Amino acid sequence: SLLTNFESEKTGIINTLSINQDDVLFAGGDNGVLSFYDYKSGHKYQSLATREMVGSLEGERSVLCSTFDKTGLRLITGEADKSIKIWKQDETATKESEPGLAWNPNLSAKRF
Amino acid sequence: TSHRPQLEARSGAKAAAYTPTGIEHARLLPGHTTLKYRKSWRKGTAFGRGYINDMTKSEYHQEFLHKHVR
Amino acid sequence: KIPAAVSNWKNPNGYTVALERRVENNTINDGFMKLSEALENADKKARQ
Amino acid sequence: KEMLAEARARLLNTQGKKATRKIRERMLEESKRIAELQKRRELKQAGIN
Amino acid sequence: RGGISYDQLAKLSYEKTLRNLATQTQNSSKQDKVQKDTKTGKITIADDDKLVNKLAVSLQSESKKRYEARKRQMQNAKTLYGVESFINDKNKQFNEKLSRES
Amino acid sequence: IRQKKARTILQHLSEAWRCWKANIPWDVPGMPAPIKKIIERYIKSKADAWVSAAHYNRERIKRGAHVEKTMVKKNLGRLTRLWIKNEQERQRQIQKNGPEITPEEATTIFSVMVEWLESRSFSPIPFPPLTYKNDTKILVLALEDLKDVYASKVRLNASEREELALIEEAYDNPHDTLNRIKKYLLTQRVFKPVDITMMENYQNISPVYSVDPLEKITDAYLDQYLWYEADQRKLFPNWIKPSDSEIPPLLVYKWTQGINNLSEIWDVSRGQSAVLLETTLGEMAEKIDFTLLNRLLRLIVDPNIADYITAKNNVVINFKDMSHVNKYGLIRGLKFASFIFQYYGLVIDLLLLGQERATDLAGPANNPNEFMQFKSKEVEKAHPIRLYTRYLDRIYMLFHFEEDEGEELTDEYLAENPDPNFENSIGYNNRKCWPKDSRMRLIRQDVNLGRAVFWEIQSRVPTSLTSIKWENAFVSVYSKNNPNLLFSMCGFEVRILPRQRMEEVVSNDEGVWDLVDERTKQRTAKAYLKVSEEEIKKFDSRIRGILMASGSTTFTKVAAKWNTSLISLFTYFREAIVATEPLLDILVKGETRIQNRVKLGLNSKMPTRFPPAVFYTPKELGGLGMI
Amino acid sequence: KGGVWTNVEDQILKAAVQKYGTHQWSKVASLLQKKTARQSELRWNEYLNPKLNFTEFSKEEDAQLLDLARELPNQWRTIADMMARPAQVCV
RNA sequence: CUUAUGCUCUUAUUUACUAACAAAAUCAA
């Protein structure tokens, strides 16, 4: 059964997926844009863009593969810039200060 | 013509319905049969007194082509 | 929409395609400017 | 002009050995076929099938 | 401007076939069921022998018109352009493609 | 759409991969920019695999561990692509960022060179007149110089067929082709493009420039003309090497005799010391600037020829696809290119010696010194640079220091560059061929004095002209602590040990020179000789050249090429093969491998089938005639 | 033996580069008797290329030329890339 | 029931095709 449809629209070629125990879903982008989705609701709550390198091509900013660790508080992304980035969930952040992106659906994009 | 790129790869669907041969290969011999489980002279003269993601612009590549050309 | 590929090396069907398909903008900096004028001045000085 | 007549013919001939030979074998195969069919017709003119 | 998407062009060609079908019914006016099987699940539809012929003749005639329209377009396409040097028809054909890209 | 764009869009890749290999920028005019991001991304990915395999196989070839015959040529192809890319990049960033020399540097360079030529009363080389008494012979020497390539050739293709016609027509018409050459030196300023072919030497890949033959004729005339007038008017001083007076192993012998014959080097009664320095001039000919070159050649030569020389270095250079414009660096492949380089050597050198000491070395203009002379003891003594010489781009300096001068020179270095962890002996390099006892011992006051000399000298020449680095530099110190003064001039590697520091005098073999003091006629030192490891690896690379080029050649040619290579080996350095162990191993490894090559001509590597009468009997009796 | 270019051979070479491409010069010299693939490459890159600039001299060009030839003395392949012109015309 | 050239063994010379055979290098006059 189709459980839910995420707000994945506007991402283009998602290279990799990773799922946390905490339902943080990861979607590595070929555009370099990496987006974090709540798995239960299918909502983007963070969108981020990496830096490519000191000197490298603008197409190389892309995530190719990813995993969480056993704990789930680290995200390891191997990217096409010939590097590994370790993404870390930011502590000292309460609901206030950073709710993320607003829970705003539209019926025009008929995803639901 | 006669020199073409692939439109598709050779699929495993066709090889699954063939009959086998049972020829005996050297690398399919029994080996590792047991799994392991986890538990003043200086005055007269004219004048005295870091990583880039490019294999061709790298410092090692410059030190290469200076030594291997000469 | 992708342009068709007109190569300068290969031509597998041997096509005849016009010359405009097959076939910088900066200036010299003041380093060349100041270099040549200083050498000429030194040459004029050496001539003196 | 003889250089130009050679150049005019070389620029307008694009195939190579393999395509020209394939053309020749295809024409000769059809010529063998057309011959064999009219044989059967001429034998059918005699009534022998 | 743009091209026409395959949803809209499906609709427009749907409407064109409706308009042509309506003019056939108008011209036919001027010039003057379902049974399901018990044994099998197969279904039988009673039809007139007319309008099956008329559909088949129309589809053939539309195919003829498009065939001869493209054939006359073939005739124009090899008679119009003669500026650039070529080798065969396929050279001029491909160099018409590079002119369309400009 | 799935099937129709796949044809088109991958042909864009294949075209773009060709354009990267050819250093064409690959601009498709109206291209959907995400697709241009993709194709640039994978071609950078294929670039990294292509460049890494080029580095990986080149280390594997230098080790000499089972590389294919095809893969040697494939690796020559990939490295000559990458060398020209490094060349084309270096041309572009020079043109963006301007000349490396500042105008103050070029003013100082020009002022020194003017002062030198004014001091020597040098009259510049004229343009060759209509009535020039030496003119037909200089053309004769030039055309024989061009012919001697083809006196040894058999089978020719188009470019040398029309070349050999030109020499023969120049023989038939001397006065016609002299007027054509003088007409080219006046008027011609644009030249046909030059092709680079690059030779395999299995340790380095060296460039070779092929010039147009009509340009080759007027180059060789200009080559032979300028050198005659330069040596006639005494342009180059006595210490510029190579000179026509001696062969290079006689240069090394006169150098060690000249080291011996200064007064009181070996005396270390006081704390006085002696330092020899070896430096490459790095990218000397790669970093010559033409605007300086043209102006400095106005000093030395009539401006027409000086204009010709500057014009000829600016040509299009093309490999197969890659074509660019040599608008900065000098091309060695020209015939006259010899003359500029030694002249540009003199510009570098007058910085180092200064106006006073280079006057003291080369002596007055009416009565020049020889290669090892001074007009007195005092003119020798007045400055610590006792001996200077320059062999092409290597530099050999000899410093005699009193206690006070050595102490000032090392204290100012340590004041400018302190050493609390005493790491000056870490990066210091000496000859790992000589044994550790008689190598240069790493003792602090000599190590710090050695770096302080080099730090003094690296300041004398700017980094815009040449790149004098410590990684290429070799310093030998002679002291109370070090009895050995050891250096490498030419494929020789020489260790000089004096007689008073020998403790015991033992008779040696003939690989040891006996250095003779002149005025006592007494043998006062011994210069031990070995081969450089570089020339050893050149000879091993040479033998692999015989073995890989000859696939199915006749047996007596393989044996003949071995004779040519081994005679060339043993004639140039003969004495140093006594003392070198790994050269003798490579002689064995080469000769057995060539005997294995003849054995592979048959299907037998049997010893009993091949007694040494098979290989070593001369050709008159029917053998290979191997040596 | 070093021959001059007729306008016949000029038209073969332009039709050759139109089919073969600018890199296959030995393909071009096969059609072109008496001439070399070096000579064929040299003329197309010095004369026959329609991208080249054979026209009148504006006073901006003449002031630019006398600047460049004073600043870069006798570097004509260098100056002709700065002027975007053929080199012997620039001389 | 229409009936029409049987190539000789060796040696020499000449010509044609063919080996997709081979080859003056260092060096001494």
mmCIF file with all atom_site columns, C-alpha atoms in Angstrom, chain F residues 467-528:
data_model
loop_
_atom_site.group_PDB
_atom_site.id
_atom_site.type_symbol
_atom_site.label_atom_id
_atom_site.label_alt_id
_atom_site.label_comp_id
_atom_site.label_asym_id
_atom_site.label_entity_id
_atom_site.label_seq_id
_atom_site.pdbx_PDB_ins_code
_atom_site.Cartn_x
_atom_site.Cartn_y
_atom_site.Cartn_z
_atom_site.occupancy
_atom_site.B_iso_or_equiv
_atom_site.pdbx_formal_charge
_atom_site.auth_seq_id
_atom_site.auth_comp_id
_atom_site.auth_asym_id
_atom_site.auth_atom_id
_atom_site.pdbx_PDB_model_num
ATOM 1  C CA . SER F 1 467 ? 63.644  29.116 -9.715  1.00 0.00 ? 467 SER F CA 1
ATOM 2  C CA . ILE F 1 468 ? 66.679  28.250 -7.600  1.00 0.00 ? 468 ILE F CA 1
ATOM 3  C CA . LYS F 1 469 ? 65.394  25.897 -4.910  1.00 0.00 ? 469 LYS F CA 1
ATOM 4  C CA . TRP F 1 470 ? 66.984  24.016 -2.048  1.00 0.00 ? 470 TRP F CA 1
ATOM 5  C CA . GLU F 1 471 ? 65.373  20.765 -3.214  1.00 0.00 ? 471 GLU F CA 1
ATOM 6  C CA . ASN F 1 472 ? 67.602  20.776 -6.292  1.00 0.00 ? 472 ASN F CA 1
ATOM 7  C CA . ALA F 1 473 ? 70.623  22.218 -4.536  1.00 0.00 ? 473 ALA F CA 1
ATOM 8  C CA . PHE F 1 474 ? 73.663  20.291 -3.363  1.00 0.00 ? 474 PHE F CA 1
ATOM 9  C CA . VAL F 1 475 ? 76.183  21.813 -0.965  1.00 0.00 ? 475 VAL F CA 1
ATOM 10 C CA . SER F 1 476 ? 79.473  20.239 0.104   1.00 0.00 ? 476 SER F CA 1
ATOM 11 C CA . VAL F 1 477 ? 81.482  21.664 3.006   1.00 0.00 ? 477 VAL F CA 1
ATOM 12 C CA . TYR F 1 478 ? 85.151  20.996 3.788   1.00 0.00 ? 478 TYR F CA 1
ATOM 13 C CA . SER F 1 479 ? 86.190  21.724 7.358   1.00 0.00 ? 479 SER F CA 1
ATOM 14 C CA . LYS F 1 480 ? 87.851  20.336 10.458  1.00 0.00 ? 480 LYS F CA 1
ATOM 15 C CA . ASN F 1 481 ? 84.836  18.052 10.653  1.00 0.00 ? 481 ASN F CA 1
ATOM 16 C CA . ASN F 1 482 ? 84.508  17.231 6.962   1.00 0.00 ? 482 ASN F CA 1
ATOM 17 C CA . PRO F 1 483 ? 87.591  16.167 4.970   1.00 0.00 ? 483 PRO F CA 1
ATOM 18 C CA . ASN F 1 484 ? 85.527  15.415 1.855   1.00 0.00 ? 484 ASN F CA 1
ATOM 19 C CA . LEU F 1 485 ? 84.568  17.938 -0.820  1.00 0.00 ? 485 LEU F CA 1
ATOM 20 C CA . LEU F 1 486 ? 82.155  15.991 -2.991  1.00 0.00 ? 486 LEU F CA 1
ATOM 21 C CA . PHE F 1 487 ? 80.247  17.149 -6.053  1.00 0.00 ? 487 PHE F CA 1
ATOM 22 C CA . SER F 1 488 ? 78.586  15.987 -9.297  1.00 0.00 ? 488 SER F CA 1
ATOM 23 C CA . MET F 1 489 ? 79.669  17.934 -12.446 1.00 0.00 ? 489 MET F CA 1
ATOM 24 C CA . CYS F 1 490 ? 78.458  15.876 -15.472 1.00 0.00 ? 490 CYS F CA 1
ATOM 25 C CA . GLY F 1 491 ? 77.402  12.215 -15.078 1.00 0.00 ? 491 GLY F CA 1
ATOM 26 C CA . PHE F 1 492 ? 80.564  11.890 -12.961 1.00 0.00 ? 492 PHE F CA 1
ATOM 27 C CA . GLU F 1 493 ? 80.225  11.945 -9.187  1.00 0.00 ? 493 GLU F CA 1
ATOM 28 C CA . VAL F 1 494 ? 83.488  13.125 -7.660  1.00 0.00 ? 494 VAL F CA 1
ATOM 29 C CA . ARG F 1 495 ? 84.787  12.927 -4.089  1.00 0.00 ? 495 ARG F CA 1
ATOM 30 C CA . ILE F 1 496 ? 87.930  14.919 -3.397  1.00 0.00 ? 496 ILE F CA 1
ATOM 31 C CA . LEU F 1 497 ? 89.962  13.965 -0.341  1.00 0.00 ? 497 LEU F CA 1
ATOM 32 C CA . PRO F 1 498 ? 93.268  15.761 0.330   1.00 0.00 ? 498 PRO F CA 1
ATOM 33 C CA . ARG F 1 499 ? 96.505  14.041 1.204   1.00 0.00 ? 499 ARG F CA 1
ATOM 34 C CA . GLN F 1 500 ? 96.925  15.501 4.682   1.00 0.00 ? 500 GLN F CA 1
ATOM 35 C CA . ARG F 1 501 ? 93.371  14.385 5.616   1.00 0.00 ? 501 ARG F CA 1
ATOM 36 C CA . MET F 1 502 ? 93.978  10.796 4.333   1.00 0.00 ? 502 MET F CA 1
ATOM 37 C CA . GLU F 1 503 ? 95.679  9.828  7.659   1.00 0.00 ? 503 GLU F CA 1
ATOM 38 C CA . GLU F 1 504 ? 97.146  6.909  5.659   1.00 0.00 ? 504 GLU F CA 1
ATOM 39 C CA . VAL F 1 505 ? 98.081  6.867  1.971   1.00 0.00 ? 505 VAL F CA 1
ATOM 40 C CA . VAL F 1 506 ? 97.064  3.652  0.228   1.00 0.00 ? 506 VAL F CA 1
ATOM 41 C CA . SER F 1 507 ? 97.591  2.933  -3.447  1.00 0.00 ? 507 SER F CA 1
ATOM 42 C CA . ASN F 1 508 ? 94.392  2.910  -5.457  1.00 0.00 ? 508 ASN F CA 1
ATOM 43 C CA . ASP F 1 509 ? 93.057  1.574  -8.724  1.00 0.00 ? 509 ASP F CA 1
ATOM 44 C CA . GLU F 1 510 ? 92.790  3.731  -11.855 1.00 0.00 ? 510 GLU F CA 1
ATOM 45 C CA . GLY F 1 511 ? 89.289  4.957  -10.916 1.00 0.00 ? 511 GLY F CA 1
ATOM 46 C CA . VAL F 1 512 ? 90.966  7.450  -8.578  1.00 0.00 ? 512 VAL F CA 1
ATOM 47 C CA . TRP F 1 513 ? 92.463  10.635 -9.946  1.00 0.00 ? 513 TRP F CA 1
ATOM 48 C CA . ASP F 1 514 ? 95.707  11.932 -8.494  1.00 0.00 ? 514 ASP F CA 1
ATOM 49 C CA . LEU F 1 515 ? 95.326  15.675 -8.243  1.00 0.00 ? 515 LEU F CA 1
ATOM 50 C CA . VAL F 1 516 ? 98.624  17.459 -8.776  1.00 0.00 ? 516 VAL F CA 1
ATOM 51 C CA . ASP F 1 517 ? 99.559  20.771 -7.230  1.00 0.00 ? 517 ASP F CA 1
ATOM 52 C CA . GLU F 1 518 ? 101.221 22.855 -9.923  1.00 0.00 ? 518 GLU F CA 1
ATOM 53 C CA . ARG F 1 519 ? 104.104 24.616 -8.214  1.00 0.00 ? 519 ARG F CA 1
ATOM 54 C CA . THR F 1 520 ? 105.311 21.649 -6.131  1.00 0.00 ? 520 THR F CA 1
ATOM 55 C CA . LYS F 1 521 ? 104.423 19.096 -8.856  1.00 0.00 ? 521 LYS F CA 1
ATOM 56 C CA . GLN F 1 522 ? 103.336 16.910 -5.927  1.00 0.00 ? 522 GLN F CA 1
ATOM 57 C CA . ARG F 1 523 ? 100.213 14.798 -5.665  1.00 0.00 ? 523 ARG F CA 1
ATOM 58 C CA . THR F 1 524 ? 98.273  16.523 -2.897  1.00 0.00 ? 524 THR F CA 1
ATOM 59 C CA . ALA F 1 525 ? 94.759  15.081 -3.154  1.00 0.00 ? 525 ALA F CA 1
ATOM 60 C CA . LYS F 1 526 ? 92.785  12.200 -4.587  1.00 0.00 ? 526 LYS F CA 1
ATOM 61 C CA . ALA F 1 527 ? 89.541  12.663 -6.495  1.00 0.00 ? 527 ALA F CA 1
ATOM 62 C CA . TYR F 1 528 ? 87.555  9.474  -6.300  1.00 0.00 ? 528 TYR F CA 1
#
